[PDB]
Amino acid sequence: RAVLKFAQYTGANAIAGRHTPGTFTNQLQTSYSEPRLLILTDPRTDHQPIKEAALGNIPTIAFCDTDSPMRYVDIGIPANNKGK
Amino acid sequence: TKHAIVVKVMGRTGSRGQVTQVRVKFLDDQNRFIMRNVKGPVREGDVLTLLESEREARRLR
Amino acid sequence: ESLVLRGTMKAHTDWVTAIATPIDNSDMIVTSSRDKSLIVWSLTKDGPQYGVPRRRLTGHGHFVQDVVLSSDGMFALSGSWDGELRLWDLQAGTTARRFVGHTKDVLSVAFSVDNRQIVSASRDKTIKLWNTLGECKYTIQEGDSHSDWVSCVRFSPNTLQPTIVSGSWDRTVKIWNLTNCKLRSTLAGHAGYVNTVAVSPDGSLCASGGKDGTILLWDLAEGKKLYSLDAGSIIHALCFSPNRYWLCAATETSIKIWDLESKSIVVDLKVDLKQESNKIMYCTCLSWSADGSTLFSGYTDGLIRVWGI
Amino acid sequence: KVHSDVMLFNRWTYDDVQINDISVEDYITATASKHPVYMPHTAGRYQAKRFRKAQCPIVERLTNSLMMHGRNNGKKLMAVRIIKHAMEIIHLLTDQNPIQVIVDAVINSGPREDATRIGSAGVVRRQAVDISPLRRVNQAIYLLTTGARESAFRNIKTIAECLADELINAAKGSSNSYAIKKKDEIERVAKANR
Amino acid sequence: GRVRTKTVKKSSRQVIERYYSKMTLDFHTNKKILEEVAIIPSKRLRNKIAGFSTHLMKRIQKGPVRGISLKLQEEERERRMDFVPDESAIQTDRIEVDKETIDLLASLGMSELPGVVLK
Amino acid sequence: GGGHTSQIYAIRQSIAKALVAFYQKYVDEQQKKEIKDILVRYDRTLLVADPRRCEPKKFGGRGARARFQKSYR
RNA sequence: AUUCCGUUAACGAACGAGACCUCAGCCUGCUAACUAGCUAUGCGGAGGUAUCCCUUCGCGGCCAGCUUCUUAGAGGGACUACG
Ligand SMILES: [K+]
Ligand SMILES: [Mg+2]
Numbered sequence A: 001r002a003v004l005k006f007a008q009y010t011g012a013n014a015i016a017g018r019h020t021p022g023t024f025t026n027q028l029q030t031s032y033s034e035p036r037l038l039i040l041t042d043p044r045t046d047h048q049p050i051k052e053a054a055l056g057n058i059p060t061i062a063f064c065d066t067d068s069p070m071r072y073v074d075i076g077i078p079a080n081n082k083g084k
Numbered sequence B: 001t002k003h004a005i006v007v008k009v010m011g012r013t014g015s016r017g018q019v020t021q022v023r024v025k026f027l028d029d030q031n032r033f034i035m036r037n038v039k040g041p042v043r044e045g046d047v048l049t050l051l052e053s054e055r056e057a058r059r060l061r
Numbered sequence C: 001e002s003l004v005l006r007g008t009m010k011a012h013t014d015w016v017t018a019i020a021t022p023i024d025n026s027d028m029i030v031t032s033s034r035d036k037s038l039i040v041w042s043l044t045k046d047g048p049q050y051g052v053p054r055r056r057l058t059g060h061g062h063f064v065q066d067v068v069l070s071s072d073g074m075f076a077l078s079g080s081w082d083g084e085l086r087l088w089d090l091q092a093g094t095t096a097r098r099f100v101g102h103t104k105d106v107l108s109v110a111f112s113v114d115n116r117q118i119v120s121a122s123r124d125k126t127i128k129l130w131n132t133l134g135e136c137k138y139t140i141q142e143g144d145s146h147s148d149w150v151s152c153v154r155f156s157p158n159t160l161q162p163t164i165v166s167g168s169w170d171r172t173v174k175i176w177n178l179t180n181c182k183l184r185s186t187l188a189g190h191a192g193y194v195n196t197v198a199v200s201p202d203g204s205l206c207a208s209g210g211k212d213g214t215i216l217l218w219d220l221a222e223g224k225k226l227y228s229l230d231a232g233s234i235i236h237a238l239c240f241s242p243n244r245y246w247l248c249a250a251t252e253t254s255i256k257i258w259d260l261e262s263k264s265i266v267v268d269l270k271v272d273l274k275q276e277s278n279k280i281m282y283c284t285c286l287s288w289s290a291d292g293s294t295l296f297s298g299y300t301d302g303l304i305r306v307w308g309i
Numbered sequence D: 001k002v003h004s005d006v007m008l009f010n011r012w013t014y015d016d017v018q019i020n021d022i023s024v025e026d027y028i029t030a031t032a033s034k035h036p037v038y039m040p041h042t043a044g045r046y047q048a049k050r051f052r053k054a055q056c057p058i059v060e061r062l063t064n065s066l067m068m069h070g071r072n073n074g075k076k077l078m079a080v081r082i083i084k085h086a087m088e089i090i091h092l093l094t095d096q097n098p099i100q101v102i103v104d105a106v107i108n109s110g111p112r113e114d115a116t117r118i119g120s121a122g123v124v125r126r127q128a129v130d131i132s133p134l135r136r137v138n139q140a141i142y143l144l145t146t147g148a149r150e151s152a153f154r155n156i157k158t159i160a161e162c163l164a165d166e167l168i169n170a171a172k173g174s175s176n177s178y179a180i181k182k183k184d185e186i187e188r189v190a191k192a193n194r
Numbered sequence E: 001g002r003v004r005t006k007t008v009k010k011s012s013r014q015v016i017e018r019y020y021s022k023m024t025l026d027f028h029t030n031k032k033i034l035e036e037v038a039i040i041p042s043k044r045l046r047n048k049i050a051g052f053s054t055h056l057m058k059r060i061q062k063g064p065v066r067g068i069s070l071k072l073q074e075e076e077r078e079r080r081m082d083f084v085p086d087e088s089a090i091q092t093d094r095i096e097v098d099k100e101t102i103d104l105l106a107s108l109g110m111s112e113l114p115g116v117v118l119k
Numbered sequence F: 001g002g003g004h005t006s007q008i009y010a011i012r013q014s015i016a017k018a019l020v021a022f023y024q025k026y027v028d029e030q031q032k033k034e035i036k037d038i039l040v041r042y043d044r045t046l047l048v049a050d051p052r053r054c055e056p057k058k059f060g061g062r063g064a065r066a067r068f069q070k071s072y073r
Numbered sequence G: 001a002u003u004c005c006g007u008u009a010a011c012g013a014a015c016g017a018g019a020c021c022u023c024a025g026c027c028u029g030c031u032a033a034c035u036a037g038c039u040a041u042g043c044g045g046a047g048g049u050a051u052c053c054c055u056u057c058g059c060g061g062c063c064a065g066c067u068u069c070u071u072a073g074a075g076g077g078a079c080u081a082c083g
Helices: A002-010 A047-053 D058-065 D076-094 D098-109 D133-152 D159-171 D178-192 E006-018 E027-037 E043-062 E071-081 E099-108 F004-026 F029-042
Strands: A038-040 A060-064 A075-078 B002-013 B019-026 B033-039 B047-050 C004-009 C016-020 C030-033 C038-043 C051-057 C064-069 C075-080 C085-089 C094-099 C106-111 C118-122 C126-130 C136-140 C153-155 C163-166 C173-177 C182-187 C194-199 C206-210 C214-218 C225-230 C235-240 C246-251 C255-259 C265-269 C283-288 C294-299 C304-308 D113-118 D125-131 E095-097 E116-118
Touching: A038 A047, A047 A060, B002 B033, B033 B047, B033 D113, B047 D125, C004 C051, C016 C283, C016 C294, C030 C064, C030 C075, C030 C294, C051 F029, C064 C106, C075 C106, C106 C153, C118 C153, C153 C194, C163 C194, C206 C235, C206 C246, C246 C283, D058 D076, D058 D098, D058 D133, D076 D098, D076 D159, D098 D133, D098 D159, D098 D178, D113 D178, D125 D133, D125 D178, D133 D159, D133 D178, D159 D178, E006 E027, E006 E043, E027 E043, E095 E099, E099 E116, F004 F029
Parallel strands: A038 A060, A060 A075, B033 D125, C016 C064, C194 C235, C235 C283, E095 E116
Antiparallel strands: B002 B019, B002 B047, B019 B033, C004 C304, C016 C030, C030 C038, C038 C051, C064 C075, C075 C085, C085 C094, C106 C118, C118 C126, C126 C136, C153 C163, C163 C173, C173 C182, C194 C206, C206 C214, C214 C225, C235 C246, C246 C255, C255 C265, C283 C294, C294 C304, D113 D125
């Protein structure tokens, strides 16, 4: 809900739920996208989007808890990304 | 020679599944349950005549 | 006042589709059902059952969707899903006539005031007018006609201007001039398909109900709609009381009666199985008695319930 | 008591016929309340589902089991006639209702215990097991008809006479019946292989 | 067994999606509707699709069904989910913070924030 | 058609159905229902035909299911 | 049933399976039958009280009626529909 509202008000695109592998690399996929920026709620649960973005020159922003992995995180925002 | 009523069927038993293992409750004593191996079709609610009730059934397989 | 259960009739074995009552207030009544049969009843107030099946007719090859009694009462006309209409003689249980020409299922059948013209509604989006002989004089299948199933068709009681009001599944109720068989007025105020149409005995009101669950009343003189009455459930039948001046609607939840003077629900009738002693259970058709002192309701459980004043 | 106008062969009545074995009561159809029939010929579908054949009349099951060995396969009118004559002879000899005699013979002929083969790889090892009531009834019928058939073979005695004698000697545990001896042997083997 | 193949499931899902307004819970009416609004080469396939569509409608009446996107259901969910309470569920009047958070704020210089009280 | 047993069964079924229909069409429906219930409670085949038919035989055997004897040596 | 539900660095597809087609099983509902039948009638034979009545057989009616029985075209019917 937070990401949906953020996309609604800022004007960006939101993807809530499971991320389809190859969305950033499979150019023939129907859901193929070429974002200029990626925002993620949790690096740990959003590992697949981060790994895919690492293959397409896509900068990343993520809310990182104390135990979040920082790999392929360009701008990490230190915050509790588990409580609603 | 006692009479017991089948309360539930545990399943087929033996190498070829020839016998079925069931839990039977004695009619004379309603608080005693025993394990028996049965040959031939059998379902819940059936009554068997046990020529001897001392033995406990074990999986044939 | 209030309506209470009087008894049950348990001859049919499938959904009851329609009920017909004699004008002379005779004991006999005729009801259709999905069991492909028409049952002629012999009502008996005394005894364990309010009525018993005097005779059964099984000429039709598919579900019988409608049945109407003639003014004389010795003839009955009923339509079926086989797209064929046949007149019934209530003297020996033998078909008296057959009407052919409808390509798809027939849903509505009505008798003219003079019992000299027959109007039927079919799923082929067409309305045809037949005489007693068995020839369709005219067929309404032009652009003016509806674009979906013609669920219900009724005859205007007012003999001064012969007119027919027909519903459909395209959210439109149309009025056709009988004299020239041309469009007289078109009504469009529904959001969901309308599957029932009623006409007041005087001939000044028309109640339309369907999926939307709202009953819309229209004036026959000009077609202007008066007001809307909610039901909260899909509407299946609509009938006007002969003298009490009421409006009873058959809905999936239950049968509710409205008073047109006050617009308030006169009474809500819910069927309870314990009192008498498929889970989806509701009234599919209803019809008032000749004198209006009794209401007959058909249900999906193949049972007919009788409500008395 | 339950009264039924239906009479087997229009000669025998199902009234006063009661099964006296709780174990196999539910798998015998020989009572006035359990759909009595006029003849043991009913051309029904009893193999559609498990346990359905228990609803077939016991007399019909005996008739069916009398059609064994190829030369007699499908010859049901002859088997029905044989059953009718055997019932007449039973009534003559014992003065009881033939249906009751048949029921008692079935009850007394069914084995209660058996030894089932166990293990594998060419090993002769057996373990005693119980017999279900339906299998007990089936074995009783098979043993009775087998005894009658073996008695009738190469003997001037008719098949009906042999069947009647077998049923009479099985209704009471006379041990002169082939079925009784076979059941005793089976139970002895089961006891030995406990 | 009786397991509807991919064809029947897809046809029922698409038909319900496109014509949910006219759908009913009666098999015969559903099969008539399918005959009207779809081309099915075989009568048996039409009957199977009608039955599965009736089953899907019965499931939908209870609540949402995965794989079927009805416009009214989504609109109603959005309307219900765009509402807000009269009072926000964030109380800034009283905030219970451990001592460590107190040193945190003191280092930040925010030692006078209203509503911040030690346990 | 048929044989000696099939003809008898068909005759009895026809008698039952004819009586039921005659009572339905020229006698009170109540009595027709009573006789129909009495007939059905005894045997359902008295009014409903048995659908069993002979299974066609398949090549490779004498019967519908029976196959020719197989030998390996 | 690699049939489906789902899980998911896979997403979309193409074959096989299924669908399909033939035969059989239900239709007192439709069309039509002197190269298929039924019903009643007219006449005739036989029997029974021998006229009239009853039972059973044989022969005609393309202007006696009809399609239950037979044939074969169109359709309906089952979808696990309902508990
Ligand atoms: K002999
Ligand atoms: Mg015919």
